[PDB]
């Protein structure tokens, strides 16, 4: 049974940099791509990264580029967000979450997600 | 460039009758469109996929259909508990995106 | 011989071809279109003697070897479109994977006039011969990487057809009961 | 901050055979030797097992013997525990913990516990 | 085949008094000696290892020394929450094990 | 030697490029794109030793002669463009102009896949060597003459990138205060 | 020369040597004592060239390479008592371990009569000489596998005092600052 | 050949071994332990082809002759045992006895390093072949002589494992039912 587990999140200057990490259980982790997406005050909600199996390929949103790496640990079956150069915009709560691509098509519909973690970046 | 959108912004609908989010999306994204429920503080819960498939744990007064660039989320007879925010999401071509979301609010006098 | 029927550089199911349904059709045919990157995997084809169906009336007709595998791929590109992958394309049955696969059989090909290359799979199997069952002699991996390249242009999407062939041995053995026929 | 959690146990028939896992945090897990003990109604406590970093070299008490294999994952900082053969002298609850050899002696100190699993082979 | 054994099976002392807890072994086994407490229902707790070294957390009323084949722990007030069973436990050699335990128990009329 | 690396055929400035401030990076690079007409002027580079930086460094290390001075260019242009010019391309501080520069040094190009010329300028002056002053070695001028030719096509612009190269003497003269350096 | 010296197959600290305090005095001995399994590890020795004495002078009074490194082990066994073990013995500085080590250099030796092995330990570095400066040129380790084997016997414990030696190359370079001397 | 396999000097029953039980175990083994004296007989085997293990597959495959009968010893005996025995070690059937049996086939051997001997039986018998029957094709005596030598010692008792084989004749006749098979 799926239990996405975060922490790290905390207050946070700017020009600072976080690392969250979330972690992972009752599930094949390493058979699952995973993504981080984010939830900012009086806003919906904005994919962020997501990486593949491997800890191959992985993508980021325009916003998050070369300022957050994502990495998971699969001996331990957990996810990093290494967020580097953090402004405001980047305030928010991060949740983990974990997508699967079914059969084989192409879609990854996310079945679990885990609580927040809050990177107040002010 | 994908970008979905949802339609009612606010969805006031009176208990016990149904409701009708419509998402469309600015370009074709064939049956890849999932619908997600949000309670405050709370994380996001899967409702359909696939277009029209329900997740486990989902009633039947919830289900979806539509496919291309429009959408639809129907709820028969909501109940109390149905009472949140809906957004849908693609995944039919990277970067994967999420619409601006739907608040069905209770409707009284 | 029955080889060159078999042999003579065929085309493959490979795969079931997210059709149109151009894929029977197809067999041949992964899809080349552009694409949001270029590593990201597109294929992953299984292949047996057993299924597609050139390979299974000559691998029911038998039961063992004599054989290599050659697969040989061929483009339809335009002026306009072009094109690159790599393919693994796959001896048995391993890593099923990226960079496994890289270190696999090898081609390198740049799908312009050329029209035509030699990825061929050997058969590294314990034994010389390998029993026509069920679970599966292994995988064949294509990767698209870079598209097509281009025009105005072509319309976008471009196709391959895969070739499929064995030496070096020809010959095999053991006869049975050849898919085709009659009662 | 060690946090030792532990799943797994339950009601088992006598021949029968479970799997104990415990997960590990806040230490690095991959250095550390890990143990499992555990401890009887009506009785003190038993070291059963204990695995050596790397999965090396594993120890095992004189009862638990043939029965009882010991197995880490290291890529997501866990502990396993099959348990073959079950007879009733096996019942108890067990913990699994976490040793330190400290400098360079040769002495492995205790230095968490976990929370307790329950195996009623009865 | 490194045996310890605790003297006291049940040290009844008065609040506030002292209580000493002896451990010997069957044989030598340095300063790998360390002691732990042992509430009911809940997970053993650390307090002397290295024969004499307190742990993190550990209150100074509680010490430990000795070397060899004879150990002791020493808790000077004792406290109410120092009601527990004690354990003493080698790593000299494997295999590693523990003594018998020792239940330290309010005195009272 | 240090010929080499003045030598190996350099780009140039090699003027200030009206710029993206494409035109640093440029710097090789007049600009193809088409034209009212062809024939007019859009170029006129000037050059020293002094002036557009690798020249720089060298003819600050040294302040004499021997040499000549190749330009040669390259084209990025595609099937799609095309382009011609003609580059005089100067010596040595002459007449400034059209046709006089065409009685220059000379070099006729077809910009279609040759990607390279020689036009070499000469020092063509009284005395072996000039000494690094401020007024001018001297112009070399480019026109572009008719654009580019096509397709659908390349965004419409083609660029250039200069080349720049000395024989035959390879060898200076008199070292002097290198421009790179500590202190 | 020097390396005579440094050379002649000399013993070593190598490590501080849980003592008795007989680990000066060792230096060379590990321990060799009955175990409860042979496979665990007792040792672990990293080498340089600063560290342990004999090395130590050498190193000072020069800071680069010409070498090799041979460590070869004696015994004190008895008819009673015996012993075996492995040692590594570690080029530089890797992997720390078990199965790696055994990939490493490599000797099998049986500790009766024989009473002397040659592990050699190469310098396998990128650089033909490193220089003398602290982290560290690399581990040696040592196994001791299955003790000592035996009489009635002996008591119980056995050492081995551990030998150094470098060819090839025999010949330093730079001298610097030797570890002896005056003021 | 099947000969090599009767034949590749296998070990034997030889006899039910008063047993720890390591009398299966065993087989080849009688016991050696320090004795009384020296000379009395603990052991009297019986040979048959029939009778003990490997000896009977063979047997009743085959019902003829032709042969020999070695019997060759090894010992684990330590530095600290040591021991001697003679063995008889007895064809055929006759005296049953001390001096007889000495006056018999003969070997004599030391048992110290040597740790093989070889006392080799002869089917002495009025015809080339006895056939599988019940009585007996006769005994095989050891006496222990002289035990064992020491030290501290060795856990007194030390045990040999006898061996079998036949020459010269390698080959035999008439194959019969094997002991081992199927229904």
């Given at each position: 049974?799926?239990?996405?587990?975060?922490?790290?999140?905390?207050?946070?200057?700017?020009?600072?940099?976080?690392?969250?990490?979330?972690?992972?259980?009752?599930?094949?982790?390493?058979?699952?791509?995973?993504?981080?997406?984010?939830?900012?005050?009086?806003?919906?909600?904005?994919?962020?990264?997501?990486?593949?199996?491997?800890?191959?390929?992985?993508?980021?949103?325009?916003?998050?580029?070369?300022?957050?790496?994502?990495?998971?640990?699969?001996?331990?079956?957990?996810?990093?967000?290494?967020?580097?150069?953090?402004?405001?915009?980047?305030?928010?709560?991060?949740?983990?979450?974990?997508?699967?691509?079914?059969?084989?098509?192409?879609?990854?519909?996310?079945?679990?997600?885990?609580?927040?973690?809050?990177?107040?970046?002010? | 460039?994908?970008?979905?959108?949802?339609?009612?912004?606010?969805?006031?609908?009176?208990?016990?009758?149904?409701?009708?989010?419509?998402?469309?999306?600015?370009?074709?994204?064939?049956?890849?469109?999932?619908?997600?429920?949000?309670?405050?503080?709370?994380?996001?819960?899967?409702?359909?996929?696939?277009?029209?498939?329900?997740?486990?744990?989902?009633?039947?007064?919830?289900?979806?259909?539509?496919?291309?660039?429009?959408?639809?989320?129907?709820?028969?007879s909501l109940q109390s508990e149905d009472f949140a925010v809906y957004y849908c999401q693609q995944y039919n071509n990277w970067p994967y995106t999420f619409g601006q979301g739907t608040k069905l609010e209770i409707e009284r006098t | 011989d029955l080889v060159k029927i078999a042999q003579?550089?065929?085309?493959?199911?490979?795969?079931?071809?997210?059709?149109?349904?151009?894929?029977?059709?197809?067999?041949?045919?992964?899809?080349?279109?552009?694409?949001?990157?270029?590593?990201?995997?597109?294929?992953?084809?299984?292949?047996?003697?057993?299924?597609?169906?050139?390979?299974?009336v000559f691998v029911n007709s038998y039961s063992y070897f004599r054989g290599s595998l050659v697969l040989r791929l061929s483009v339809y590109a335009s002026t306009f479109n072009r094109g690159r992958l790599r393919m693994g394309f796959f001896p048995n049955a391993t890593t099923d994977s990226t960079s496994t696969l890289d270190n696999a059989i090898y081609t390198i090909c740049d799908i312009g006039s050329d029209n035509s290359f030699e990825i061929t799979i050997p058969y590294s199997f314990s034994?010389?011969?390998?029993?026509?069952?069920?679970?599966?002699?292994?995988?064949?991996?294509?990767?698209?990487?870079?598209?097509?390249?281009?025009?105005?242009?072509?319309?976008?999407?471009?196709?391959?057809?895969?070739?499929?062939?064995?030496?070096?041995?020809?010959?095999?053995?053991?006869?049975?009961?050849?898919?085709?026929?009659?009662?």
């Amino acid at each position: 049974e799926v239990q996405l587990l975060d922490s790290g999140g905390g207050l946070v200057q700017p020009g600072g940099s976080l690392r969250l990490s979330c972690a992972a259980s009752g599930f094949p982790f390493s058979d699952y791509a995973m993504s981080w997406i984010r939830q900012a005050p009086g806003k919906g909600l904005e994919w962020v990264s997501p990486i593949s199996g491997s800890g191959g390929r992985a993508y980021y949103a325009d916003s998050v580029k070369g300022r957050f790496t994502i990495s998971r640990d699969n001996s331990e079956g957990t996810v990093y967000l290494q967020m580097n150069s953090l402004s405001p915009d980047d305030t928010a709560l991060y949740y983990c979450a974990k997508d699967g691509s079914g059969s084989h098509y192409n879609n990854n519909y996310f079945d679990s997600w885990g609580q927040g973690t809050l990177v107040t970046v002010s | 460039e994908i970008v979905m959108t949802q339609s009612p912004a606010t969805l006031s609908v009176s208990p016990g009758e149904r409701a009708t989010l419509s998402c469309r999306a600015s370009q074709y994204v064939h049956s890849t469109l999932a619908w997600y429920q949000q309670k405050p503080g709370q994380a996001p819960r899967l409702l359909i996929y696939y277009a029209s498939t329900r997740a486990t744990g989902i009633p039947d007064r919830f289900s979806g259909s539509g496919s291309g660039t429009e959408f639809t989320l129907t709820i028969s007879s909501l109940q109390s508990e149905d009472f949140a925010v809906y957004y849908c999401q693609q995944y039919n071509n990277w970067p994967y995106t999420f619409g601006q979301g739907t608040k069905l609010e209770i409707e009284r006098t | 011989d029955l080889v060159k029927i078999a042999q003579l550089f065929s085309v493959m199911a490979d795969s079931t071809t997210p059709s149109e349904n151009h894929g029977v059709d197809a067999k041949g045919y992964f899809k080349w279109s552009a694409t949001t990157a270029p590593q990201s995997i597109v294929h992953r084809n299984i292949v047996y003697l057993r299924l597609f169906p050139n390979l299974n009336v000559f691998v029911n007709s038998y039961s063992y070897f004599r054989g290599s595998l050659v697969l040989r791929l061929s483009v339809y590109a335009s002026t306009f479109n072009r094109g690159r992958l790599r393919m693994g394309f796959f001896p048995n049955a391993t890593t099923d994977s990226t960079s496994t696969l890289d270190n696999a059989i090898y081609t390198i090909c740049d799908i312009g006039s050329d029209n035509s290359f030699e990825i061929t799979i050997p058969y590294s199997f314990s034994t010389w011969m390998r029993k026509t069952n069920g679970h599966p002699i292994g995988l064949f991996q294509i990767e698209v990487l870079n598209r097509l390249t281009y025009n105005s242009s072509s319309p976008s999407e471009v196709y391959c057809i895969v070739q499929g062939k064995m030496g070096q041995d020809a010959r095999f053995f053991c006869p049975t009961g050849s898919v085709v026929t009659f009662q």
